[PDB]
Amino acid sequence: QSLQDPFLNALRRERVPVSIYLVNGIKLQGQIESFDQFVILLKNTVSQMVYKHAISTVVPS
Amino acid sequence: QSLQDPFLNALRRERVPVSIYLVNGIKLQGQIESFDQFVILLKNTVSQMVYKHAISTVVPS
Amino acid sequence: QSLQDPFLNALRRERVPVSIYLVNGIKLQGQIESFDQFVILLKNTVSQMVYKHAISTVVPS
Amino acid sequence: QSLQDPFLNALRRERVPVSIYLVNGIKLQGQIESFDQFVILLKNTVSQMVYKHAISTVVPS
Amino acid sequence: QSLQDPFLNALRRERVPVSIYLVNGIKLQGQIESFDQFVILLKNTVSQMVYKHAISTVVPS
Amino acid sequence: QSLQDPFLNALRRERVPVSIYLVNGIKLQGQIESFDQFVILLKNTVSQMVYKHAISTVVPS
Ligand SMILES: Nc1ncnc2c1ncn2[C@@H]1O[C@H](COP(=O)(O)OP(=O)(O)OP(=O)(O)O)[C@@H](O)[C@H]1O
Ligand SMILES: Nc1ncnc2c1ncn2[C@@H]1O[C@H](COP(=O)(O)OP(=O)(O)OP(=O)(O)O)[C@@H](O)[C@H]1O
Ligand SMILES: Nc1ncnc2c1ncn2[C@@H]1O[C@H](COP(=O)(O)OP(=O)(O)OP(=O)(O)O)[C@@H](O)[C@H]1O
Ligand SMILES: Nc1ncnc2c1ncn2[C@@H]1O[C@H](COP(=O)(O)OP(=O)(O)OP(=O)(O)O)[C@@H](O)[C@H]1O
């Protein structure tokens, strides 16, 4: 049904450290501040906006 | 749609070890835990969310 | 319009061996088993689900 | 749409030998047999189906 | 829309020499003849059709 | 509705220096002059139009 939002929501609520791999193979690490339909906000030392279209995978680190 | 979900649900139901090849050539392995319109869930040691847009092919390993 | 379905049907209906080139230069080969809006099913040694967004060209082998 | 369809139609109608550069760096050559919303059919020797999403540029050779 | 069409239209009416960078690092050069919703026509010697999906940046050169 | 728009707007309004990482690992730097649904205009020397589909991350620099 819907899997993406619960997975990301749960990762956020529980403040879980995640690795975000980009489609070019670059790995980003932080925690999920928020997300909407197109982007995921990732906090570490500064918050950065990652476009979903550039993401391959999100996995707990 | 009408071909994807059954293919994916069969693998999920039957606990088939699968290879997911990404568009960047990276090959991920595991079993399909779940999926929605946009993402596929692959389990072994951690559950990782893979965006379909980053996927090239899904195959039994 | 729709050019894609007939082209692929003809290959499926008539068991033409086909070479499928992916956006990362990799080339798959087999027989078009079926397809829907988003995926093609290559059947060769195995049934594999190829996302069309990962495909660059489809050529008769 | 209003610039793309005319551009492609002229090439097909006038039997112009074309070069289709793909995003992956491959260059396909041939004549445009036909096109629709999603693909271009490019001939010669055989007909090859090209997904527009894989194309960067289309130019007469 | 409120940003893209005015930017491109100004470059077109004013015949500004432009660099169009593709997502693969290819840099095209020319002037904008025309655009629609999906493509940009870039001309110097020969008008070439560039798909927007393959474009990263458009810059006055 | 948006997380994306507020994030980009705050950076724009406060002239916050940003790094825009493209999907091909190329890094752009500047200030966000403006944006719409599909593009971002990034300031000096000469403003350049960047397609969002080509962007991986926007980071305050
Ligand atoms: N789950 C994954 N999804 C997408 N890409 C991955 C994944 N795991 C690894 N990669 C990519 O494969 C390449 C090599 O993987 P590598 O094992 O170095 O990952 P790592 O996170 O750097 O280290 P490790 O996996 O040992 O923790 C890297 O470029 C990385 O981006
Ligand atoms: N169906 C596919 N879709 C996308 N990429 C693929 C596919 N099959 C292989 N590749 C990639 O193309 C390259 C060549 O494949 P090759 O068969 O040599 O890999 P391998 O190391 O033998 O093991 P594997 O094929 O299972 O990755 C590999 O880097 C692989 O990740
Ligand atoms: N504004 C831009 N948008 C997208 N790609 C660009 C841009 N500028 C340069 N590139 C690409 O980055 C690559 C770097 O090569 P080049 O030396 O020509 O540019 P560059 O000035 O090094 O770019 P940078 O220093 O920002 O990495 C080139 O392949 C080029 O096509
Ligand atoms: N936040 C980010 N988003 C996307 N790509 C990044 C990011 N940070 C780094 N990269 C990419 O990873 C490469 C090297 O990774 P690293 O994290 O070491 O960045 P860096 O080279 O130290 O600094 P910079 O990213 O400014 O080049 C860079 O070439 C860059 O393109």
Numbering used by the authors:
A (entry chain C), B (entry chain D), C (entry chain E), D (entry chain F), E (entry chain A), F (entry chain B): 5 to 65
Paper text:
More recently, Hfq was shown to mediate the interaction between trans-encoded small regulatory RNAs (sRNAs) and mRNAs, which can result in translational silencing or activation. Crystallographic studies of the conserved core of Hfq of different Bacteria revealed a hexameric ring-shaped structure, similar to Sm and Sm-like proteins involved in RNA transactions in Eukaryotes. Biochemical, genetic and structural studies suggested two distinct RNA binding sites on Hfq. The proximal site appears to preferably bind sRNAs, whereas the distal site binds A-rich motifs.
